[PDB]
Design a binder for this molecule. Structure first.
Ligand SMILES: [Zn+2]
Ligand SMILES: [Zn+2]
Length: 110
């Protein structure tokens, strides 16, 4: 995609220092995260629109027995038939609502 601007780098770096924003709404502190693009990798400002997510909320489906205890622990990118944007939203919040939560936590004006 498009290389980030300096302002995008500053924002992304702030977001990337947060624990998983989806786990956080469930009271769980998951601090090993990667950034997830909500709105692609090319449009202006797209790199400001990223969520810090744990491995299980980003790309990996946890074992079913684990999801029985943590049913909201589903990846925003489907892994087989587990997760995807719609199921992730159902069990958490929309991506843009989580982005607002992340901005609040990182003390970024929004
Ligand atoms: Zn998580
Ligand atoms: Zn992603």
């Amino acid at each position: 995609g498009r290389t980030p601007t300096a302002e995008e780098r500053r924002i992304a770096n702030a977001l990337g220092a947060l624990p998983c924003i989806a786990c956080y709404m469930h009271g769980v502190i998951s601090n090993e995260v990667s950034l997830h693009h909500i709105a692609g990798r090319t449009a202006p400002g797209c790199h400001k629109k990223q969520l810090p997510l744990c491995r299980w909320h980003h790309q990996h489906a946890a074992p079913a027995e684990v999801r029985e205890k943590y049913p909201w622990l589903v990846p925003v990118h489907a892994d087989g038939v587990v997760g995807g944007k719609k199921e992730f939203t159902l069990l958490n919040k929309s991506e843009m609502e989580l982005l607002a939560d992340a901005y609040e936590m990182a003390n970024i004006m929004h």
